[PDB]
Ligand binder design. Sequence first.
Ligand SMILES: [Zn+2]
Ligand SMILES: [Zn+2]
Ligand SMILES: [Zn+2]
Ligand SMILES: [Zn+2]
Ligand SMILES: [Zn+2]
Ligand SMILES: [Zn+2]
Ligand SMILES: [Zn+2]
Ligand SMILES: [Zn+2]
Lengths: 363, 363, 361, 361
Amino acid sequence: MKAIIVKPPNAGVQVKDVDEKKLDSYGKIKIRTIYNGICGTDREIVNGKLTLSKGKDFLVLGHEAIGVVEESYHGFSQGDLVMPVNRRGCGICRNCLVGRPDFCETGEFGEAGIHKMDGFMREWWYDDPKYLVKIPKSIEDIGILAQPLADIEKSIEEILEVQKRVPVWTCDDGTLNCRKVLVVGTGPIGVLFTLLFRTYGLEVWMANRREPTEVEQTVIEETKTNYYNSSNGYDKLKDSVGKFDVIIDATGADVNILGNVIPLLGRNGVLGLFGFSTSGSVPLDYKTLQEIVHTNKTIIGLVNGQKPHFQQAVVHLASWKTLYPKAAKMLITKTVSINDEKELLKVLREKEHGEIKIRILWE
Amino acid sequence: MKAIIVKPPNAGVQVKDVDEKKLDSYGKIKIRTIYNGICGTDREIVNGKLTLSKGKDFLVLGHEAIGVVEESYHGFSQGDLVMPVNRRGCGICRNCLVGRPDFCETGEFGEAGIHKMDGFMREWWYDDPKYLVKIPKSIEDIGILAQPLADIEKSIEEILEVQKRVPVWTCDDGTLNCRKVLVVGTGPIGVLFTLLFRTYGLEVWMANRREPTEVEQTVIEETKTNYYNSSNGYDKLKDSVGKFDVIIDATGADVNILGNVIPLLGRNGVLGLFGFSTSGSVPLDYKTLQEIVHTNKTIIGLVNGQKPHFQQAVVHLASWKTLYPKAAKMLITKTVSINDEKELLKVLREKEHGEIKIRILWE
Amino acid sequence: MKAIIVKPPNAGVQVKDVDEKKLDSYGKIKIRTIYNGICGTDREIVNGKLTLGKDFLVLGHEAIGVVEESYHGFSQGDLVMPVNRRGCGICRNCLVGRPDFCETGEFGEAGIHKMDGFMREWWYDDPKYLVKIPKSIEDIGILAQPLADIEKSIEEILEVQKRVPVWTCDDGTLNCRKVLVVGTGPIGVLFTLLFRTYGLEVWMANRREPTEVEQTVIEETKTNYYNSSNGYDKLKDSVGKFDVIIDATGADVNILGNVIPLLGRNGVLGLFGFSTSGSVPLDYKTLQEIVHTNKTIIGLVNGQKPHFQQAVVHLASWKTLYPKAAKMLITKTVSINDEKELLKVLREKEHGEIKIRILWE
Amino acid sequence: MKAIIVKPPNAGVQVKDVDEKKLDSYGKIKIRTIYNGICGTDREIVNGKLTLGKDFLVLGHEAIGVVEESYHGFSQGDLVMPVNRRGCGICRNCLVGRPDFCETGEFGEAGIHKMDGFMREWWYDDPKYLVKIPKSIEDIGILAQPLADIEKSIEEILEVQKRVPVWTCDDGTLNCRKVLVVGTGPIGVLFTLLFRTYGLEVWMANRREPTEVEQTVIEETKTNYYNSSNGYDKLKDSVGKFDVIIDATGADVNILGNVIPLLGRNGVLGLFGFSTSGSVPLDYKTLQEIVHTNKTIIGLVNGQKPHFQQAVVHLASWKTLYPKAAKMLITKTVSINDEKELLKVLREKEHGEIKIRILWE
Ligand SMILES: [Zn+2]
Ligand SMILES: [Zn+2]
Ligand SMILES: [Zn+2]
Ligand SMILES: [Zn+2]
Ligand SMILES: [Zn+2]
Ligand SMILES: [Zn+2]
Ligand SMILES: [Zn+2]
Ligand SMILES: [Zn+2]
């Protein structure tokens, strides 16, 4: 069977034929892979940047997948498109046992194509129906985004759950339309946060240390989103716009995220950390925590969407085809054939500028 | 009228007779002061450490009070004991308008004896019944603690509201008894957090850079609370006990709270900041935020209890007289007469070692 | 100005020119009406079935209009829908923009009570009561108003079920949860579509075989159907009990007796429609059941602006997900100038009706 | 071993020596019984009013006992109370320690179903099902078991009311909210005490003037009272409508018809007791009311360990806050050795009864 394989924690990736007898099976339903997605986590593993590593000589890469059901089973018809949920439970703790290993208490969950579990960049795999999300054919083209968007659906749900601590966090009109969000860093993560917050009606500002890419300009225009070039810091944004109800660190590209953005966070506000710097140290002034304390601010770590969030992603992706057709059409950056080895190895190893999502097509 | 008066932002305090015509009235019910409490905020103002300051030459100090209703009004009988709520609304925002200025969006709320409002260290004051909490006579002796405990009731309520984001945060027995809390710093704040968490059934560890005071030993013994001397840091506590579900920075006595305690916080855990350092800077390693992100941790600023929390305080104080009589008896450190000027000025200006709560008696 | 007018509580309806100066204005934005929707409440008012210096009231609470000149957030040519129930100005719920929970009952209702409705050539409104309707859902966006009531109703039911320590399924979703929707028409169909969007298993029930639309819904959304002409025993035998039951149309005088035996442990009966006459025997065993198993009965009514905005998102989604069903929800469009056919549809529902639209031109 | 035994569904009860070897053991901690409580459910079982290789079942689900030897968290001499309903081992709710929401109905109930109860000299239990009873509430701590059901019921009602955007009052509390408690006895009195603890205004109602205890509660807790012998019209005229109504004792066959007209907008009717016979006319206007105003009816049952622990806190609080009421909740104590008087109180409630305790000695 053809697979894309890695050997963690070391650098390197191969697209080659492997013995299917050695590849992990997770249930009874046979699924033939049609698309994979690639993200930053894949690049890190490919480049041996995930310094963590059983009877296996290699691990099948990839946790973003759409496959076709090969034979009708229970509820699944031959030809149905499915996406597998990638983080799976530790089998022990109460969160995993209710289908929510995003909140696993032991840290012993499995992550397809990352840790403990062969991923989905292979011709086909067997799965358990309970880990499959149905992908309507009417979203086949952008449906691979359901996996990364699930993370964002869970992150926003959590933010809103947290904000129930505020006796009234709605606006004069009963909505959250008056609430302002700053999305720090774009790429597929910040773009997806922006689109989802705008879906929900909140005002959004996207920020990068640069002028907008073409996709970002389309998002700005079509979703009526604002943009801030933060190349010279955030003083001008605070002076013009003021403070934000929610700030999202989407890309972890600011070594001083707290110092830079807490001053921009408004009373009762939430800073959600999704990306984070992977090296360094910075000074922490005492005024940062004093301000958090005085105004009931919260900082929350944001990670991992689960099956309900995958299903919510599907619904939103479907809505965007009608609400934001121009932007939706721009989110798949390109599709590379599994048979184009040179171009495939290139996109596995490194992002391209402006990239939102690269898909791999199985042919 | 006799009052204790300050002149912010400058240092100094006087116990003297003042013209009652110039003192703030807040409604129709006449209340004769019987007790005041003193806390750290009073010491700061007295010592001109609150560097923030209208037609007034002075401000009546004090936001912790029990008074006696002077004449029967509506629902209040002559002789009834009452405590005033100290933070009051800005009159504009939606949180204030539902009686919750602890979440004020404008920051224009008033704080009795601190900012915009004469406090309650005066022979008597007029109030609005809606700002009064009924203090049962059966808790007259410790009832002054209802004000600081209200802050703690609101802080824990908020923590538990936040933890609803976790699909299951209860234990195998449906309780929170398996959940462990580290209370960093004692004094009246950390003692009250400890007693309340134990009321709720969670396991608690109190921590200071010293061996326990006598009151703390009584709490340890009577409430079955644990104790950790953190003089040499937290490594030995982590090695023996592991990690905590909630950590409370009660006293703000650690310039490196994040660095020191995030490593002790468990998956899905909450760090609640109630105290905070008032000067300095410390290094922030990147690993701190990476850990917050990976395990859905939250940091929350904790401040200000409101009327429902005052009423909850009353109920708990009543329960402690039965559940923890030894500790309850030790929480009022001493009572100083308004007529003992030397001893009164001394306790206004400085805390004593081991102090939980000093009461002023009006005679 | 041309308007469709009524004179509550008296029966009757007229399409006539009226004096624009005596009509209610609600803000600074002039909106030219393009579509109205008609529903059951309109039929009741027109037939004088409700008791609720103006000589008439402009009818209609379902509307889409076009902003005539740019003002603050709204541009010339934007499509907008007004929120129909508005606050009493006194209570805390209305003050946070939620008169669906009004504590005084003194809220206004456009085209019903204290407020001229939207079946008129144009009206002035306040941006705060306007919901933006994307051009991409112009054809079905009139449904955002009735859909809002359903959004609110489902939200409320899910909020109530947070009382259950774990109401999710082994996979973390609500996919294992079963809903019985009693009665279709626009209300039961909208409840069905929305519950299927959320992933719950749905059974639609009526005392008859499916309509053309219903069959489309069944097939396209994988929804189940039960003919209840001879009661529900056979449904209970074959599928067992339901986690949520919705009385959509209020067309069963014995709803409690007939459906509580089909409600499962910890289950919720949501009442949206209700019978408008009569008295029926309540057995003691009904309540005994309700008590032992933490069952809840909840009256469901009125969606507010956040629900209108959620409706917009879902309608957009159904154009992609359920295109065949979505194209069948608008039953017909009647011209404001076709007086004969207009009076006929105001006065009586047509068999099979989901939503009739009035076009202004 | 001496035990109080029954043989369900047959009527009757015996106090006799039984073979300890054939009795249920639930864990490693040996507990010597000191008190049992008796309630309505016990009277029903003894009179064979429930249909629910053992020849008998040990009766009793309300107990306090003393730990005989130290084991893990529990020391020799600690007072403990067992949680009486235990999980089915299959469903997600039971698996998170909440069989009050058991989805299979296959949970065990001590002294009722699948589990020997606690009216026996001693039993073995698992620390996970034991609630610590402080020595300082030994005299009234037997009430922690029925109080737990009330803790859970009020918690559930407040959870449900989070659906209301603002259900608090102008002062941020629930002080403005009014509760009508229909029926007293141990259930209505406990509901009353607990709602007053939370600060809500309470009216107790019965078809009679107050008992001695009730008058003490009225005065000491500032609770209101209504004689409902001639219906509730005069209550509605004088006070208006209620935000929460609790049917505590199920002693009104027309509860819905009689109290829904007294339930206010967004209000909740919580059903704890229920009628055990009969059929009554349900008018259509009842549901119409429920629908227009977001009313909810909720069946209330069974508290679990967190509720037992909350009960302990509140009982401790009432010793300080409401000492006179608290000293009147234990109606009498009957010796396990006074067989005549013991059989009499197992078989029938006494007039005025709140709680009868059995003492083991
Ligand atoms: Zn990825
Ligand atoms: Zn786990
Ligand atoms: Zn203080
Ligand atoms: Zn405010
Ligand atoms: Zn309508
Ligand atoms: Zn209102
Ligand atoms: Zn009982
Ligand atoms: Zn169960």
